[PDB]
Every structure is written in C-alpha cells, then in structure tokens.
Amino acid sequence: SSSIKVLKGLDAVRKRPGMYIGDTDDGTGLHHMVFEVVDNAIDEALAGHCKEIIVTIHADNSVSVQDDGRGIPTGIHPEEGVSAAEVIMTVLHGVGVSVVNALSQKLELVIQREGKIHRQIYEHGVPQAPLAVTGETEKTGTMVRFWPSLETFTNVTEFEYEILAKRLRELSFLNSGVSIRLRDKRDGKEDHFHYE
Ligand SMILES: CNc1cccc2cc(C(=O)Nc3cccc(CC(=O)O)c3)c(=O)[nH]c12
C-alpha cells in the first residue's frame, strides 16, 4: 500500500539515476552518494546532537558514515507498518538517503539508541527484514555503510580519497564546530577536519 509507493520511488531512481545522483560514468554521481549520506549526519550535528563524524573507505570498495548523534528513531511509525528508520531510508524526500539506498547493491544500517543496537540490511533499497535489535549498548548514533550498485556505476567505480577529502574539508568549514574523520582502510591514510 505504502510499500507500493516506495517501490515506485525506487524504480524511479534506478531508472533515471542522473536525475537524482548525477552522472554515472564520471565519478561525479558515485562520490555524491557519500556526500548525501554525510549530509544527513551534518543535519544531526546542526541539531546539536552529533560531535564527531567518521567517513571510512573500506577495502571492498564500500563507504561508511558514522555519527554519535541520537540515532534514527526506531519506533514502528504506526500509520505505515514499519520503524521510522525504515521510512527515512526508503521514502523519496539534498535528495535523501533513499536515493543512495536505491542505487546501492547492499546497504547496512546500525542504530544505537535507548540502550539498544538495531541493525537492518537493504538490497537495492529493499529491506531484508524489519529493523531488529542485535544487542545492548550505552552509546548512541547512526552508521550507514553502502556498496555502490555496479549496474548503475561504470568507468569510475572506485572512490578517490582526495575527492572525499576535499568535500569533507569544505563541509567542516561551512559547518563550524563539526569534526569529521576520513580513513582509508585500503592504505591507512587518515585526515581530520575541523574549522574551530
Ligand atoms: C551516518 N548518519 C546518518 C546517515 C543517514 C541518515 C541519517 C538520519 C538521521 C536522523 O534522521 N536522525 C534523527 C535523529 C533523531 C530524530 C530524528 C527525527 C527528527 O527529530 O528530525 C532524526 C541520523 O541521525 N543520521 C543519519
């Protein structure tokens, strides 16, 4: 019913990715996938709940963004039949994570909130299962890790550290007070962005 519109939106995006993410052969859209997710963590930092953000380039050519904010609300949003988090990750409308989720072959969500750790896995924007609790924790935050769909992205398929590094530096300048870490698991290089 609402799943109907969601899958409609997901179609829409995988069908015309240039309309939402940008160019799929350039590097431009692929890297925009990261900034869209980081964008979301910056909102949580503009709300005064997030102090540090961690962008990691993993060795299998996936990227993750971790914040120590509140964590996305997990309560089943009882108009639709699923966690508020799932609605955030899957509904269309800065374009929203659902664009990134739709063009990701795989996407892992981990939320730490009200003393629990919740995990959900998606494939091409579609949940494997409802948001489920995997254990206790005393910290809070949201972590989104995604693997770009190779059906969508070609040519430039690998993330460039210096392209992220540049945009993350810029975003730290524009949002005074946030701290951002970039780590490349491939060769160990790190950097830290913070403009007092
Ligand atoms: C990497 N981090 C990361 C990635 C992708 C998406 C998100 C989304 C959120 C998020 O929607 N958070 C949030 C927290 C509490 C209450 C509400 C509802 C509200 O009051 O506006 C929203 C986040 O925190 N982090 C995200």
XYZ file of C-alpha atoms and ligand atoms in Angstrom:
222
model
C 0.000 0.000 0.000
C 2.735 2.351 1.097
C 5.205 -0.356 0.138
C 3.653 0.279 -3.291
C 4.805 3.910 -3.479
C 8.228 3.073 -2.060
C 8.927 0.513 -4.774
C 7.552 3.045 -7.265
C 10.108 5.583 -5.965
C 12.904 3.037 -6.071
C 12.125 2.184 -9.687
C 12.105 5.844 -10.493
C 15.591 6.351 -9.177
C 17.309 3.238 -10.568
C 15.635 4.067 -13.957
C 16.887 7.671 -14.162
C 19.815 7.949 -11.706
C 21.200 11.144 -13.363
C 18.038 12.950 -12.312
C 18.816 12.287 -8.599
C 22.501 11.412 -8.092
C 24.296 12.840 -11.144
C 26.484 11.271 -13.804
C 27.081 7.553 -13.575
C 30.350 7.285 -15.624
C 32.220 10.361 -14.350
C 32.991 9.663 -10.750
C 30.601 12.573 -10.002
C 27.479 10.637 -9.001
C 29.439 7.868 -7.240
C 31.123 10.358 -4.899
C 27.840 12.318 -4.460
C 26.478 9.093 -2.921
C 28.877 9.661 0.009
C 28.121 13.324 0.457
C 24.398 12.678 0.523
C 24.847 10.309 3.472
C 27.326 12.715 5.177
C 24.789 15.494 4.574
C 22.342 13.598 6.770
C 24.856 13.285 9.598
C 25.558 17.027 9.341
C 21.847 17.776 9.885
C 22.082 15.768 13.150
C 25.154 17.872 14.020
C 23.319 21.128 13.184
C 20.648 19.963 15.693
C 23.305 19.864 18.392
C 23.459 16.105 18.976
C 26.470 15.000 16.902
C 30.046 15.847 17.774
C 32.097 13.525 15.510
C 31.548 12.005 12.070
C 33.634 9.199 10.641
C 33.789 8.543 6.906
C 35.613 5.295 6.119
C 36.646 3.979 2.680
C 36.668 0.187 3.163
C 38.849 -2.286 1.248
C 35.912 -3.914 -0.628
C 35.226 -0.531 -2.135
C 32.227 0.416 0.057
C 31.946 3.546 2.225
C 30.516 4.111 5.685
C 29.477 7.240 7.610
C 29.240 7.014 11.411
C 27.897 9.676 13.752
C 27.439 9.807 17.521
C 24.074 11.588 17.425
C 20.721 10.442 18.839
C 20.299 7.519 16.401
C 17.412 7.397 13.935
C 14.091 6.756 15.723
C 13.275 3.030 15.726
C 9.641 3.008 16.918
C 7.194 1.489 14.438
C 5.595 4.575 12.912
C 2.127 3.045 13.267
C 0.414 4.600 10.206
C 2.799 2.603 7.972
C 3.702 -0.804 9.433
C 7.475 -0.296 9.973
C 10.174 1.528 12.010
C 10.500 5.269 11.405
C 14.136 4.465 10.388
C 12.935 2.282 7.523
C 10.659 5.114 6.299
C 13.641 7.515 6.355
C 15.846 5.055 4.394
C 13.198 4.192 1.767
C 10.932 7.187 1.087
C 11.833 9.860 -1.512
C 12.086 13.370 0.121
C 19.687 17.280 -0.755
C 17.753 14.220 -2.059
C 17.588 11.882 0.972
C 19.370 8.632 1.717
C 16.723 6.670 -0.201
C 18.447 7.766 -3.457
C 21.692 6.308 -2.175
C 19.894 3.208 -0.845
C 18.147 2.664 -4.208
C 21.452 2.708 -6.116
C 23.253 0.569 -3.610
C 23.572 -3.121 -4.232
C 23.843 -3.575 -0.458
C 23.341 -1.171 2.482
C 23.811 -1.801 6.240
C 22.140 0.418 8.874
C 23.197 0.279 12.533
C 21.451 2.469 15.130
C 22.416 2.748 18.807
C 19.557 4.195 20.790
C 17.748 3.899 24.140
C 20.345 1.339 25.260
C 19.991 -0.967 22.236
C 21.735 -1.671 18.905
C 19.435 -2.179 15.941
C 20.565 -3.491 12.529
C 18.779 -3.637 9.125
C 20.159 -4.754 5.737
C 18.870 -3.498 2.338
C 19.425 -4.644 -1.270
C 18.778 -2.052 -3.969
C 16.767 -0.118 -1.336
C 14.675 -3.115 -0.268
C 14.795 -4.329 3.378
C 15.801 -7.938 4.052
C 13.935 -7.794 7.331
C 12.359 -5.296 9.650
C 14.680 -3.316 11.918
C 15.774 -5.782 14.573
C 17.606 -5.457 17.892
C 21.010 -7.209 17.951
C 22.227 -6.217 21.468
C 22.717 -3.732 24.347
C 24.913 -0.607 24.199
C 25.426 2.526 26.307
C 26.290 4.861 23.386
C 24.187 6.440 20.660
C 24.454 7.135 16.902
C 23.778 6.115 13.306
C 26.111 4.240 10.956
C 25.253 3.735 7.263
C 27.517 1.589 5.110
C 26.759 1.196 1.412
C 28.180 -0.721 -1.567
C 27.516 1.103 -4.895
C 25.459 -0.912 -7.424
C 27.699 -1.793 -10.388
C 24.604 -1.949 -12.583
C 24.328 1.806 -12.087
C 28.004 2.933 -11.895
C 30.612 2.362 -14.554
C 34.007 3.517 -15.603
C 34.936 5.344 -12.408
C 33.889 2.681 -9.906
C 36.403 3.292 -7.135
C 36.331 6.046 -4.565
C 39.164 8.584 -4.626
C 40.384 9.642 -1.203
C 41.281 13.199 -2.288
C 37.825 13.841 -3.752
C 36.200 12.992 -0.411
C 38.940 14.698 1.499
C 38.268 17.956 -0.363
C 34.490 17.935 0.061
C 34.725 16.936 3.750
C 37.197 19.765 4.402
C 34.702 22.137 2.775
C 31.804 20.826 4.801
C 33.795 21.321 8.013
C 34.427 24.928 7.031
C 30.731 25.533 6.241
C 29.547 23.922 9.493
C 31.776 25.433 12.153
C 32.192 23.131 15.100
C 31.756 19.682 13.488
C 34.594 17.253 13.463
C 34.984 14.825 10.606
C 37.409 11.978 10.194
C 38.299 10.383 6.899
C 40.045 6.979 6.998
C 41.064 4.921 4.016
C 41.201 1.268 5.032
C 42.988 0.450 1.764
C 46.336 2.079 2.690
C 45.814 3.505 6.176
C 45.744 7.269 5.402
C 43.704 9.412 7.729
C 42.726 13.004 7.983
C 40.752 15.198 10.351
C 38.634 18.223 9.531
C 37.548 20.816 11.988
C 37.371 24.568 11.468
C 37.102 25.999 15.035
C 25.577 8.476 9.176
N 24.351 9.026 9.691
C 23.176 9.063 9.038
C 23.067 8.615 7.731
C 21.848 8.653 7.064
C 20.668 9.126 7.639
C 20.661 9.591 8.936
C 19.489 10.065 9.503
C 19.499 10.530 10.819
C 18.239 11.050 11.509
O 17.215 11.178 10.867
N 18.298 11.334 12.818
C 17.284 11.715 13.615
C 17.524 11.536 14.963
C 16.529 11.803 15.892
C 15.285 12.259 15.489
C 15.028 12.415 14.143
C 13.663 12.942 13.744
C 13.805 14.451 13.941
O 13.594 14.934 15.086
O 14.184 15.155 12.967
C 16.027 12.151 13.207
C 20.800 10.497 11.535
O 20.852 10.891 12.706
N 21.917 10.034 10.978
C 21.936 9.577 9.715
